[PDB]
Write a protein that binds this ligand. Structure first.
Ligand SMILES: C[S@@+](CC[C@H](N)C(=O)[O-])C[C@H]1O[C@@H](n2cnc3c(N)ncnc32)[C@H](O)[C@@H]1O
Length: 263
């Protein structure tokens, strides 16, 4: 590992208990990333799997994606997340599902046998890894996939650094994200031998999601304050305000990546 993820920093900041619950409010139950179940439905709309398939979710969070994939396809699903408190919640909320497993571990410390998974799936999680660690992860993913297996990712991406301003640099620093442009990210995946690579800019869709997420939040302000704090309310509102502004100027981007292991 080049740059270990700062687990304690994450737990104390972006993924505080209060922060996680605030994300669930804005995205919907079981989700802490863009679009919640809405985006998940769209992202998986072309994917075909069955009850005998095996899927890895890298950065499984509270388990929404795993629940969805298992519900839609009946697949065996294995979610990995570095954050143990999340994994604990994911387990507690999915005790009914024999084909869903969650594991608390840094994905970079996981080893899976060659040809384990029909699909490797990751939603806004790889942004936590340094460039070198992204590359190491993609090389592992290539090994872990079955022949013809699919890698399917959404992730935050960015413009070149010379166009970053102080407020954007501050956000990146606060989040400990490592972002890069979409086509560079696609190139990294290609360099690991993946074929049929698609590296697509879905920022227009991202903006659609952000706008409705924010308007619903503001409509429900008084309700939010009954259960959660004004601090978390303003954190969400200001955070979405800046994401909307920064995607409109092409600074913060949403990338979609699909690739296939071909022998
Ligand atoms: C923005 S959340 C998204 C979670 C989930 N995919 C979702 O859509 O709700 C990013 C997740 O990546 C996880 N994560 C960060 N670094 C990781 C690593 N090295 N290995 C596994 N998970 C990691 C975090 O703990 C967090 O749950």
């Amino acid at each position: 590992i080049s740059e270990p993820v700062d687990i304690k920093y994450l737990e104390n900041n972006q993924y505080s208990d209060e922060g996680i619950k605030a994300y669930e409010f804005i995205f919907g139950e079981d989700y802490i990333s863009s679009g919640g179940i809405i985006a998940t439905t769209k992202i998986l709309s072309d994917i075909q799997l069955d009850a005998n398939s095996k899927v890895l979710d890298i950065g499984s969070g509270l388990g929404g994606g795993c629940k969805y994939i298992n519900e839609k396809y009946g697949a065996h699903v294995h979610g990995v997340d570095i954050c143990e408190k999340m994994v604990t919640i994911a387990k507690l909320r999915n005790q009914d599902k024999a084909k869903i497993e969650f594991e608390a571990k840094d994905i970079l410390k996981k080893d899976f046998p060659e040809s384990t998974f029909d699909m490797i799936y990751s939603r806004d999680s790889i942004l936590h890894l340094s460039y070198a660690d992204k590359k190491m992860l993609f090389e592992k993913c290539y090994k872990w996939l079955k022949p013809n297996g699919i890698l399917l990712i959404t992730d935050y991406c960015a413009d070149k650094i010379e166009n970053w301003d102080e407020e954007f640099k501050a956000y990146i620093k606060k989040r400990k994200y490592t972002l890069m442009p979409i086509q560079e990210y696609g190139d990294l995946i290609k360099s690991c031998k993946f074929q049929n690579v698609e590296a697509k800019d879905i920022s227009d869709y991202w903006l659609e999601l952000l706008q409705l997420e924010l308007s619903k939040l503001e409509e429900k302000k008084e309700e939010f304050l009954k259960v959660y704090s004004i601090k978390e309310y303003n954190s969400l509102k200001d955070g979405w305000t800046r994401k909307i502004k920064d995607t409109k100027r092409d600074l913060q981007k949403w990338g979609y990546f699909k690739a296939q292991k071909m022998i």
